[PDB]
Nucleic acid binder design. Structure first.
Lengths: 95, 46, 271
RNA sequence: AGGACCGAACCGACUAAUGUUGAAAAAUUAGCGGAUGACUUGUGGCUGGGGGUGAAAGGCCAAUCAAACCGGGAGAUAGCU
RNA sequence: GCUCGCCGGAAGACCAAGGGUUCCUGUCCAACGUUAAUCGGGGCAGGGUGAGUCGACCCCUAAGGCGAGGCCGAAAGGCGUAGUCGAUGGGAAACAGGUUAAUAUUCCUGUACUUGGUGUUACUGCGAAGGGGGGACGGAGAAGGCUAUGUUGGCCGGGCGACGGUUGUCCCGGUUUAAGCGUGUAGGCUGGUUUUCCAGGCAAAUCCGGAAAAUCAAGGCUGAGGCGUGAUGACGAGGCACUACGGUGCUGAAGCAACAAAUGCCCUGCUUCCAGGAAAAGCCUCUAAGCAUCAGGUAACAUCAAAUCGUACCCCAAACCGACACAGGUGGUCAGGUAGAGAAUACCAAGGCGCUUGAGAGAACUCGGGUGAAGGAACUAGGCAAAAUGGUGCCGUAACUUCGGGAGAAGGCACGCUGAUAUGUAGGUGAGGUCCCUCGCGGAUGGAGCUGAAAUCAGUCGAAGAUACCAGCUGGCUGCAACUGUUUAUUAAAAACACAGCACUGUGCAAACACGAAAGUGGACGUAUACGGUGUGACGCCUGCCCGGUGCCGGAAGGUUAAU
């Protein structure tokens, strides 16, 4: 793979109680990634950018909720969530 | 009792879906009329 | 074995069924089978072009050889089978070289019978040959109307054709309908008759039976409304007109045959 | 063996009452007919209005049918109110 | 929180469809919720859907669709060939336990499995869009083998109990454990093996089919379940510690046996019937073009890959279809106890609910019921509705009949409990032992335990023993229709329609006919014992007269007549 694509994959750390739970207990981190990225590219991109060892990447797609602002009905955008399993010898960095 | 609309997606889309219209002269005329009235959605699509 | 039923239920009463004990119980010969779909009597416009058809049990097309063109090579009769596609029974026969074909099962045929086809063949039932080599007056079935095309005439159970004349290129046949027709002598035919001639005896006894055979109910015209039929409603039971088909053409006696092509062949009408 | 018998699911609709600005634009309750077959039901397909389809009642074709629905001719015509 | 009550072949649990966030938490109460609402499927904010092995995708086709060329058609367009799509069908593989406020066959623990890619090694004739097998198929029936599952006993933990009695033949609870891997049983199917020839399988074939010898009798294929392992593991009543009283952590007994038993599996089997019961790919083999120490194939070990999308929640419904939080409608799956023929019914279990206005009063009248003196259809269009009948066994049963029926005709008799025959019988299952063995999931003997009808005799209670729910009213005469069916969705279910059968008539195959300006298609891959049309409508007895009228069929002599 090209690195240029990589740096475009990973949007953001996902923060929540489930997230923290897996991160502590099972050694796993949770990411909002570009809607189109795949398990290959996420494995690559973490292993590259955080420089730590990925075991496997499980993913899902979150359908955005439907909202009302001032009677108007909008739709929050979709996105993709990735549970990323780290091989155990790793210990977390948050930058 | 059993009413008239028993929904199905595959049915809905084969009957009225975009491609189904585009198949024929008449259908493309429908899609012409709609584009001319300026609808929000032409056909039934998800 | 044509047999009546003891009436254990009103339906079973009039039923006459024809049990041929000699028939093969168990599956046909697969490599000789085809897929067949029922049309509901409906053409490629989906309209009903022929009424009263549909339902019926599912059937598989047995591929029956009407050309009988594998020549001068003896073949022996392995077994008799039931063909759902037609009135008559059929035979599964084995040519010496290792080929099997289905044929129409003629009378006098049973497991073990040697038969054969070609110009040279002996005259005994179940043998086929071009007709100038057939004794005049002899009885035959599965007759072609054009050389090499395959059999068309007398394929039904018990039917047959008598050969009444040989003149030049044209033999004259007495057709089963009673009508004298010329056919060119170079068309192969098959000796004897079609078997299971007792097919016509069997009685259905109950509407359900007819419905298995793919036949749907038939509404008498004069029962319908004046819009649906020419025979039309009336108050109570009323007729008033000469009988016609649903499209208005006169029935009960009107000759509908029109061809000027095939005329030179037909000697005389049936009567 | 059976368009066999008794009988639940299942399919149907014979009577009675209630309901009739309904709990329901065709139901409910109590009984009633078929219930291994001409049965019943799921998914998909086919037949289109001077047509379909009809075990035929002019029934049925989107709660509209002795000729559907929608847009057009169209401001049809109306010695009638 | 406690009692009460309803559903339990559902008012429970899981899906598909359809919906699309309704899921879970916090927070709020205007509107929404037929009342209040602190509550909600309402408002606002946050969280939530984790897959090589579950689905979709994908591979393969059905009906049907589109359809290069092609045929046809004023134009648009119609039909269809090669193709290419199209699941409701065929196609590789994962299980038990643990965990969240909300996902889990996906996460975690353990234990596996499949298909591909590269690699090595050993061996090696590999190659297809062509060939052949396989895939691959109906209804009905039968009943033998089992399992899910349940009941009792043994076992283990606890219990001596608000009121007489309860250290016992007593009471309560648990007695759970999968895929996989090894084994090869009840059963089903089939002769086997070797050699020579034949060209039928569009060309080729060592494979299929055909023929001929030779030879052997066991051989192969299939197969539920059991047993073993999986598992010193898990789960496990409970107990011991702490607790924000919501839970967390540790510890952890027994964990067997007999019997009954499916509608599930063996079984796509077996027996029988006629109405004669999909296609294609993966899959196995044969070779043609070809390629030959290359390539490619076979096995073991290593190694990598298995992409993407769906996954929350509702689905007998307050979330789908009905304008509503609507007494309606919606396919598939699971199927506990006692009674019972039963998935009916009545009462309960697991589990879910009390149907989103109450509170009084206890008139007329309406609705849904219960009971009734004496009479018993006198009611009324009409016994409409109500009542009554109602079960199992045995006895009994008419005219008439197409000999089957009618018939459940009608009518009647016994029916509870307890004891004995027998401290539980007839049967059903079949342990221990002994013998045999081609030694095993074997055979015979064997009868402990376990289960368990029915009857007879004797006694006993009650007005009543088929005590409830449940569960035929019957008979006599006659119209019509033979019969089962079908019909006016939403006032008509019939005597109407269909019907098996009967008759007429058309039609020689490029069939009549039907749909199409045409091509084409149905009729039919049928062929006069076939096909269409009309009438009649089982069966039984029969179907009489009339050709003047209209019609149809035959005739060509004359008379008459169109274009030219």
């Amino acid at each position: 793979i090209r690195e240029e694509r990589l740096l475009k994959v990973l949007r953001a750390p996902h923060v929540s109680e489930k997230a923290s739970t897996a991160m502590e207990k099972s050694n796993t981190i949770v990411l909002k990634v570009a809607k189109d990225a795949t398990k290959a590219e996420i494995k690559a991109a973490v292993q590259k950018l955080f420089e730590v060892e990925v075991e496997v990447v499980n993913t899902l797609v979150v359908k955005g909720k439907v909202k009302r602002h001032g009677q108007r009905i909008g739709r929050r955008s979709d996105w993709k969530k990735a549970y990323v399993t780290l091989k155990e010898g790793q210990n977390l960095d948050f930058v | 009792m059993k009413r008239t609309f028993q929904p199905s997606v595959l049915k809905r889309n084969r009957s009225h879906g975009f491609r189904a219209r585009m198949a024929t002269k008449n259908g493309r005329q429908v899609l012409a009329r709609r584009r001319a009235k300026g609808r929000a959605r032409l056909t039934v699509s998800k | 074995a044509v047999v009546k039923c003891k009436p254990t239920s009103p339906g079973r009463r009039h039923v006459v069924k024809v049990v041929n004990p000699e028939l093969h119980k168990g599956k046909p010969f697969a490599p000789l089978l085809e897929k067949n779909s029922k049309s509901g009597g409906r053409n490629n416009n989906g309209r009903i072009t022929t009424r009263h058809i549909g339902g019926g049990h599912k059937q598989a097309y047995r591929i029956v050889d009407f050309k009988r063109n594998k020549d001068g090579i003896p073949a022996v009769v392995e077994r008799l089978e039931y063909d759902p596609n037609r009135s008559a029974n059929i035979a599964l026969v084995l040519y010496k070289d290792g080929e099997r074909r289905y044929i129409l099962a003629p009378k006098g045929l049973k497991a073990g019978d040697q038969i054969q086809s070609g110009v040279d063949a002996a005259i005994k039932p179940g043998n086929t040959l071009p007709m100038r080599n057939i004794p005049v007056g002899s009885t035959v079935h599965n007759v072609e109307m054009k050389p090499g095309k395959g059999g068309q005439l007398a394929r039904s159970a018990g039917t047959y054709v008598q050969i009444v004349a040989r003149d030049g290129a044209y033999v004259t046949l007495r057709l089963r309908s009673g009508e004298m027709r010329k056919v060119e002598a170079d068309c192969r035919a098959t000796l004897g008759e079609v078997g299971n001639a007792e097919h016509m005896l069997r009685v259905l006894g109950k509407a359900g039976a007819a419905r298995w055979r793919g036949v749907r109910p038939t509404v008498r015209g004069t029962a319908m409304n004046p819009v649906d039929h020419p025979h039309g409603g009336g108050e109570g039971r009323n007729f008033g007109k000469h009988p016609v088909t649903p499209w208005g053409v006169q029935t009960k006696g009107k000759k509908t045959r029109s061809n000027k092509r095939t005329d030179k062949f037909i000697v005389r009408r049936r009567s």
